[PDB]
Symmetry: D2
Subunit: 121 residues, 4 copies
């Protein structure tokens, strides 16, 4: 299992110790407060009112927690994933990333606390 934090200002994301293998079932729980720039802060589902101006993940709100598995496209995580199995052919290290517009991460603040574990399978 992996426990840590995902900084909002980290454009490269956080490479975890979890290697998703075919057949794996995972659970993720995410908490905390972060911002894409404004003085306000949002939780891991991000800001529902904010327009998409070129986000790395178009299926999640700006300020949401998202992930990649190996070299996959981004997959929304939000508050977490419960006993989740990935799409076929998706495998490798899980990287967690804050959802913002490329090149605009420098003014972000805060972080999400995240736990990931493999479940029974």
């Amino acid at each position: 299992a992996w426990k840590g934090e995902v900084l909002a200002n980290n454009e490269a994301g956080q490479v975890t110790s979890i290697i998703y293998n075919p057949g794996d079932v995972i659970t993720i729980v995410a908490a905390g407060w972060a911002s894409y720039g404004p003085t306000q802060k949002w939780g891991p589902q991000g800001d529902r009112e904010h327009p998409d101006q070129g986000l790395i993940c178009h299926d999640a709100f700006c300020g949401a927690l998202v992930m990649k598995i190996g070299n996959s496209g981004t997959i929304p995580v939000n508050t977490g994933l419960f006993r989740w199995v990935a799409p076929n052919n998706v495998q490798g290290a899980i990287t967690l990333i804050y959802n913002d517009v490329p090149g605009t991460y420098g003014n972000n603040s805060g972080s999400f606390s995240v736990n990931i574990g493999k479940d029974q399978s």
Copy 2:
């Protein structure tokens, strides 16, 4: 495991099929958008700027997801719990509740989607 919705305007909360027994380890993941009155909506951690005017749970923000286990007092859930063990002397059905001031649930809206499972022990 249980999957269901908790409505924000439901002052009695949503009883689940999960009975928490001594020694149990549980995982909860919660998602969605709800409000305690205003046109704005918040996720399961609720509204970090809102003052506590007599909430059912003082250790969570207004509009947060909380729970009771049997006849316990309220316990914060927020976005969820990872491989969590209850305090001693707490046992019984898990009821999920939106955190608001008693008698003020009528103007709430939206809901949280919630998964609960028991883990290895």
Copy 3:
């Protein structure tokens, strides 16, 4: 989880720290060598060739590993149970017992080593 031993000569069995509750999923793995009297020893499935002369459990061979859950009747364990849910409405402490005829345990020898855990559910 619980690890321990159950003696072939003990009519009372071995009370474990595992309390089986409704909906629990359990796994048991059992090993070792025991006898109900003969110089030969058998593993936890017991002696497939031996007639039932009034065994405490009629659904397992003589010299098998069996259990009770609370005040239940005996339930076969044999070499173990994989991700098992109790079929009956049973609840309570797991007691492990060697399957022999009451009052004939005096000539028994050996023991089974047993691990029990609760699985995800």
Copy 4:
């Protein structure tokens, strides 16, 4: 998870669908009756009284259940493995095999029923 049978006469062993990956925790439960030649049958621990005459696994009895994980040497399984991590960083597909002397499998009979699952990690 995988459930299947391992025939005592199958010198090549039974390939499962489980790939053991780094960090995995597994549980195996095995049951049934088999023989390496004699009219008697034994369970998955094999025959504790039989000498080792060149068995594939010298750390398990003749007629025991054993396995290989990828290009590992043989590893004893017996009645099973409880929440087990593979030693010395071995990895790859799990193959289940009956423990007998090479070239003497032809007179073997019976089989073991085996469940394998991955546990929380």
